[PDB]
Amino acid sequence: MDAIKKKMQMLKLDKENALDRAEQAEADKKAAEDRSKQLEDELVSLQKKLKGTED
Template identity: 50%
Template sequence: MDAIKKKMQAMKIEKDNALDRADAAEEKVRQMTDKLERIEEELRDTQKKMMQTENDLDKAQEDLAVANTNLEEKEKKVQEKQSQTAFNSTIYWMNDRFINIASRYTTLHRIALRYTALHYAAPHCTTLHYATPHYTATPHYIDRV
C-alpha cells in the first residue's frame, strides 16, 4: 500500500509538474500571440504609411510632369518673344538704314541737280543765283517719323 501511495504521490507530483509546464507554455503562447498582434499592427501601420508615401510620390510625379509641361510652354513663349524682339530690332535697324540711305540719296540727288544746273546754266546766265535750283521736295519714299 505504501508503494501505491508513493506511486500516487509521484503521479500527483508529475501531474502538478505537467500542469505547471502547461500553464507556463500557455503563458508563453499568450505572450507570443500578443507580440504577434503588435507586430501585425505595426506591419499594417507601416503598409498604410507606405501606401500614403506611394500616393504622395504619384501625386508629386504628376505635379512634376505638369510643371515640366508648363515650363516647356513658358520657355517656348520666351523663345518666341526673343525671336520677335530680334526680328523687330532687325526691322527697326533696316528702317533706320533705309532712311539714312534715302537721305544720302536725296543729298546726292540735290548735289547732282545743282551741278547739272550750274554746269548747263552757267554759260547762259549772268548771275549764279538764277542758275541754282531751289529743290525742296522730299522724295515720296522717305518716311519721316
C-alpha cells in the same frame, strides 16, 4: 506498506509537473499572441505610409 506511498507520490508529482508546464506554455502563448497583435497593428500603418510614399 511501501509501494502505495511511492506510487501515489510519483503520480501526484507527474500531475503537478504536467499542470505547471501547461500553465507556463499558456502564459507564453498569450504573451506571444499579444505581441503578434502589436506586430499586425504596426504593419498596417507601415503599409499605409508605404502607400503614401509610393503615391
